[PDB]
Each structure stands twice: as C-alpha cells, then as structure tokens.
Amino acid sequence: EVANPEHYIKHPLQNRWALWFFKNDKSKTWQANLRLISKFDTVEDFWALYNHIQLSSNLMPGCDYSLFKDGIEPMWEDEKNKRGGRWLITLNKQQRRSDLDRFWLETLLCLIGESFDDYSDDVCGAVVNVRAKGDKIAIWTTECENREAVTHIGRVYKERLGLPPKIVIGYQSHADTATKSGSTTKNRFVV
Amino acid sequence: KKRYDREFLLGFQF
Ligand SMILES: Nc1nc2c(c(=O)[nH]1)[n+](Cc1ccccc1)cn2[C@@H]1O[C@H](CNS(=O)(=O)C(F)(F)F)[C@@H](O)[C@H]1O
Question: From atom 34 of ligand 1, which residue's Cα is the shortest distance away?
C-alpha cells in the first residue's frame, strides 16, 4: 500500500509559467533589459515566488513584470503572440495605491487557475507596466481573429477585477500597435 | 484540466 498523495504532493498547475522582469535601463535595448526570474508549475511554488518579490507598486518607474506560459517569450514577435493582442487595463495615478497590486495578483490567479475555461489555450500571459504617467496591466492572447475566445476572456477578466460596468476596457492587436500612424491604437474589441 | 478557484489558491499563500 502506498501513501495518500493528498498528504504530500504539491498541487499541480495546468501549465508551467515563467515570470520575467524588465529593468528600465536605456543604456540597453528593450530585449536585453528583459530577463527571466524563474518558472513554476505548482500552487506552492507560485506562492514561494510571489511572496519573496516586490509588489508592483514598489518597482522603479519603467519596470515590468510578465507572467507567460512556459515556451512563450513575453514579446509580441513570439510565434504565439504575433497574430494576437492584449486586453489592456489603464490605471490613473491614484490607482497605484488603491488597485495596482490587487489587480495584478488577480490577473496572476486568473492565469494559473485557468479561469477562462475552454479559452484557456488562447491565453499567452500577462504584463504589468509600472509607469509614472499611469500603470497598465494586460492579458495577452494568441489570435485576434478568435472573436469568441477574445470576447470571453475580456468579459471574465473585467468581472474578476471587479471593474464597474461603466468602465470600458479595450483589446488591441499587436500588429496594429506595431504599424499604427499616430499614438492611438484602435480597439478591435471592447467590453 | 487543472482549474482552481481564487479562494483555494489564496489559502496556500501563508
Ligand atoms: N521589440 C519589442 N519592443 C517592445 C515590445 C515587444 O514586445 N517587442 N514591447 C511589449 C509590447 C508589445 C506589444 C504592444 C505593447 C507592448 C514593448 N516594446 C518597446 O516599445 C517599443 C515599441 N515596440 S512594440 O513591440 O511595442 C510595437 F511594435 F508593437 F509597437 C519598442 O521599441 C520597445 O522599446
């Protein structure tokens, strides 16, 4: 007879995830400032990572955290990102204190808990940008033409963050962002 | 698939 696995196994995640850090240092290229922190694939190992690293609200201006599925680099040129886009959450300066860390942790829980059900495979990762003008959080998905998947992810994400219905969030294609003239990227979808 | 509720996940934080 063998031991009961409930008593001793770590609780596995559906996916292995990688957390990346972007350091604002303009003596270097964007790609060289983006570096891996570590990977995890259980609930326990997730918390061991999260509990020892700085809250987003404490990072220096211009830094990022990115959590992406193992094998997807947190850059839009990745084969799994290049045809996709992101649901973008823009925060005002006052929301760094009130909402930034709570929203980012909720984003992490949505990813590692596979909270988008049959559209989980469309999720690539998420990014938090710490910025003086206003922080941003985004969930990246793999294909901007997967209308059903993209819309479901957006609606569920907005509910999980607890945004009031009046607050509109937008989905922006990476290719649109990379090719637009002027500073606005249009939204392919809103929710 | 392994799916987890937010409160289940939060129970392991401490
Ligand atoms: N080469 C590369 N540079 C990036 C990237 C990136 O994935 N790749 N990202 C993450 C990203 C991706 C899509 C939308 C918004 C943000 C920021 N940058 C920086 O912004 C600039 C605009 N490039 S880009 O990828 O955001 C764009 F082509 F989509 F505009 C670059 O010079 C980098 O300094």
Answer: A30
